[model samples]
Target chain A: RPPQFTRAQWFAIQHISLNPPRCTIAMRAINNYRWRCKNQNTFLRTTFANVVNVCGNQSIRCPHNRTLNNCHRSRFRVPLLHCDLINPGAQNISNCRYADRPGRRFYVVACDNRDPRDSPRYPVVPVHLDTTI
Target chain B: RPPQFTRAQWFAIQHISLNPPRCTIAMRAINNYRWRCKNQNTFLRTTFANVVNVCGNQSIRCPHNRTLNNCHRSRFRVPLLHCDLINPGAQNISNCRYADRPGRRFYVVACDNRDPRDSPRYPVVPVHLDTTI
Candidate 1:
């Protein structure tokens, strides 16, 4: 069967070609029962801190021309880029959205550039369910 | 310039083709001044826990065909697979090693398979030096 979500959602999870220097991304599955979760409450959230730490705690210094304050102050939002699952052009998908929280300041953005073959070298593996927990 | 270390050290850092289901790997640069670090106490150490966590906290269940005890009990060691940094054929690289520790039960294993282009999707970024820290 075709994927339940639109191309946008698929793209958001797969998009990495742009290779934004610093960003955090999280992927979560959405199903019919959890369709409402996409609206504003269930979108996955990530932070710059998370992205930096993932890369072995490496840091990117501001360019020589740019001041540290200006370089560090900006947060780049990536739009979810989508690709077709079953057929390359079977359907168009919508971008993923973030849920609202009172104190949360960031919002979900969709990435524009799409690369059909942009899977990461390390594919995400399924985790075993914890019966003990 | 030729890399100071033999092929073994180079391979240890680059090998990834075997795609061991559960493993953790870390990369650290060693220079002439730090050459002594390689003897017994400076080899990089990683845990299966770290590998599992890197993949979005996804868990891999022991295969149904195998009991959890037998399947989960195995710790796969990867030897460092090396490729020539300059000519691709000039020098043979050695596998990276782990430093010994009194309380540490795990040891480093070299990955056999080497892929010249095994760079990760997200390249590590250099962190800015923090005077505040």
Candidate 2:
């Protein structure tokens, strides 16, 4: 069976590029668990910490060698015992670290699925800093 | 009261400030004669050269010392025996010598008195060269 992620988790992942200096990837994992539990009408108590450990373990066990260690706590490690995971590139690991940072920032997800062009500020350009030094 | 000035003489007096390299005050005498006649409506016929000579002499003779010399053609001369003329300051006579230069450039004056602002591109700021360099 193919791996599936819930809507909330997908939403979190989409905004990873928007925020900086935050652990966005770990937030996505927690969102995924919450979305699944809500849809199935079952309550499973899982903290963001638990999600991080699980995801970290899965990362190390994967054949791609993309394991990302929990830089925050040495004792709370991922469970990837014997797997030849591909090495995660510097940028990818940095992004994971950003998502796991202590004070993770998150924006409220909009419920309306309307295309951005339909809004008044449609075709918004990303913010650019003027560097006329 | 009597009017003074001549024709060919009037041409050089007007462009004093434009030609920075030469003196302008000296030229006015020659032009005054030419202008007096060419403008029988206001002319008496004069050369920019003769006008300067006569004017310089008169300037010294007149109670006012605005006398500008022939910074050029000094000996060719004019006769102004005596008078308490006002002292000529730095700028007043520069205009005179400007007219005396061997090669004096002159432009034809337009008879029309149309207001410049009435033109389509009426208001124009003087040319300003960019100094980024």
Candidate 3:
């Protein structure tokens, strides 16, 4: 017996055609059921506000040369690129630090090219964390 | 880089100590930034009302022998076990089809038991899905 998907997931499947490449997608909204009382048979509908960029391994890539330095999960403030790092005309890391969370090391660098899906903040970081910059 | 936990997740980690066995947990409440506008550097707190049973596999061992038959993610209602299935004094599965998520198969059995953890309605069921009944 395979798993059963809600209608919302079914629809999401239909929407995620193979045409699109990887994206740093933020789960903008949970349209289907924000609560448990949602219809069981119904699928979970989700909206991604800025499904932009290709999540990079070391340096995340973004559209319009967006910086991946401050690409954070908690704060919706998307990361902006450093003008001098990539190209001079772009914005610079004003106060973004040479920082990190729990496991990974950190440093600011020019945004690379890549993207993917998302998640939340937790103390448990993969111990193999390293500074990509 | 080091991972930064939201206030909510930080609280959850604090609550999940070495004392507790893994029970099937749900994200009951998102106390922190459910949105990107959530304050940066703040934590994401979550509440799981029914962290009852010990999560099991092949047969998830649950508390009070709650049948793990219809445990679902999208639907808020928790899975209730059958009396004849677990303890004759308990409730039974009314219309549970012995189903599963996209990756898992379905079955109606005396639910073996275990618990813990959570997630959402995505079409991407792990291709290596299984049926545990």
Candidate 4:
């Protein structure tokens, strides 16, 4: 089934993707579930509109590696936190560790501009985080 | 993959079950996504522990139809809001409606008593809503 996240819920959960960001989200106030850690995860310490504005400009072809058809790139660098998983496989939050690094860089996002009547909460929203340029 | 909801998140999302409560959850603050309405759903307007207490007593075999191995029945009925979907198939939140009903009834739940070391937030918590006994 398709993911059931609303734009606000998506924003609350993570700033990055249409795909669920189980590992990418910052550590929660409480750790209560077991989850696998992959290689890396990133979080944007900014407003949802800050990223939404990137989509107002023209769209561009995504990097060849990305599966999404198109993406929008920020004209300037955006500040964010980078998390590198210390343990790169299946593990719980207690065992999972990240070497978090803060940085600023240009980024790419896939936007969803479906009609507001259909999705009233978010008219034009970032649905995916494609790259950090 | 099994749903990764924490006990607190689960409590925030819905009071009754280990099974994901996509349809059972109360309507959200905003309507933004497309979802199918099943027949009916119910929500408890009480504390998680109020339901957790049911598990303190001995568990009985779940009704034959339920897939879970065992369940705990509430000694008394619970006050709840029942929602009967107006649309019983795929639809967006905009068009979907429910004829909501409020009442009380005896209930059953499946409890999770995993070690606190493994799952720190909730041990001996209700994991699933099994039935209205």
Candidate 5:
């Protein structure tokens, strides 16, 4: 059985990769008497905090760890992107967005019968870096 | 004609606005610069920076601030985001892309064309926040 995704606490797409093209994952433990994660695609193995599976999707990584097809690079937006984060020299607020194409598999999720394409907004937000000295 | 949108510099929008959007503005400049800005948006006893102009686009915010509607928000992602400087969970990344919505204006520049979405990532790359230390 799968834990509810709609009700699941989605903070952000912290990590993403590939497989069957649907590789989204969820985190957090369930608030039940048993204390565990919900989403069926995921499961804890060795540690209660360590999830063995993530929802119904499998974990993956870009080949060769090349920084080419991941979501982190959405900052250098070119004209071929598929996300909300716009390219440079465009009308963007201080808040910039990211790309979804290079890491297609990273954005599309399938569990509790949900798809990322249906989201008005993906689960990622701008990561603010504190450069305070 | 302008309004002195800032004491001169901020608010977060019902609109979010753009143009060389910093193309970066000091917004509320000079109790008066000549009669407008220490930064620019420019003149108009001319309403103050009408920003007739924005700090200076000649007004430009990301090219056309295209939307791709413009920083309405920042979401989606891939491994291309030039900020955070990360590529993935090797670690990760979320928040996605727009290609400047096929209308790049700020990603690169010269009046101040500047260069491109620089900074750390969020406030420009890795928007700093959530700090307790």
Candidate 6:
């Protein structure tokens, strides 16, 4: 199966571009271990389809080169919320604090789930944030 | 009369110590002009009464010294969320982002609505954040 955390990652970092961004709810993924605190997150303010489109349009190798899987980068810069954890080493997870830096930037993610040319939704699911340009 | 914004400031920056802090709602004061974005804020996670206790116990002059009125500093460092605006000059209020730094620190505030042996609700209202030690 495509990693179970894909849906969780989408829920974690996606927000509507026109609305005020809130890091409070977005931090849930971090608390749940669906995401990492050490790596600063750039939340997307776009549709899931747009994310899927990145994979179809531009396939490239993962920058880390640890895995052989292909990753995709956004064709256009999208509005995003850049979140950095403050005092990430706090003893209690409840004490976690996030600093939000809102701006526009390209997002990179790894896609999974095969299409036998079938499903309309999630033909290629975004399974992981590649954490790169 | 004391400034109308004092009550608003209290509502803006005060949160119960045992709970998770949310900068999203705390930022309403900044949007409403009750608080200044130029000054990084340290929000008190304590009772309103405990805040009032600071005024009665440890009175001091405001560090800015712009006014002659005395301000008060916390006798002990209190749990607080230090919020700094990300892109404080954003053109739209909705675009404003705040970075949260959660820790313990001394807080300073100007007290008003002096009691002449009168109201118990606000014996000494924390009307303004002094923005200093």
DockQ winner:
1
Worst ten-residue run, lDDT, model 5 chain B? B124-133
All candidates: TM-score: 0.25, 0.13, 0.16, 0.41, 0.19, 0.42
- Restricted to chain B, the TM-score per model reads 0.19, 0.17, 0.15, 0.69, 0.16, 0.70
lDDT of each: 0.26, 0.22, 0.21, 0.54, 0.21, 0.57
Model 6 TM-score, all chains together: 0.42
lDDT tens digits, residues A13-127, model 3? 2222111111111111121222221111111111211111112223333222363342322112223211111122323222112211111212222222221111221111111
- Per-residue alpha-carbon lDDT of candidate 5 for residues A9-126, written as tens digits (9 for 90 to 100): 2322222212212111122222121233222221111211111112212222323333323212111112211232333343323222333343211222222322443332222231
lDDT of 6 by residue, B34-95 (tens): 33343365666554445666667666777765573768887788777777777776766656
Q: lDDT tens string, model 1, B62-114? A: 34332221112113332322211222232222333332221222222221112
TM-score of chain B of 1: 0.19
Model 2: fnat (fraction of native contacts)? 0.00
User: Clash totals for all models, in order?
Assistant: 35, 60, 60, 2, 81, 0
Total clashes for model 5? 81
* Candidate 6 per-residue lDDT over residues A6-119, each given as its tens digit: 352333234322223356445654565433344356667554445667778667877765474668877788777777777767665555667888888777777777434322
How does candidate 5 score on lDDT?
A: 0.21
Per-residue lDDT over A7-40 for candidate 1, one digit per residue giving the tens place of the 0 to 100 score: 4334334332233222112222432233322322
**lDDT of residue A127 for candidate 6:** 64
Docking class of 2: incorrect
Specify the CAPRI tier of model 5. incorrect
A11 Cα displacement, candidate 6 (Å): 6.4
**Per-residue lDDT of model 2, residues B21-117, tens digit only:** 1223223333343422111111112122232332222111211122422112122322211111133332333222221223322111211111232
**After TM-score superposition, what is the CA distance of residue A54 in candidate 5 from its true location, in Å?**
16
Worst 10-residue lDDT window, candidate 6 chain B: B11-20
TM-score of chain A of each: 0.19, 0.18, 0.14, 0.70, 0.18, 0.72
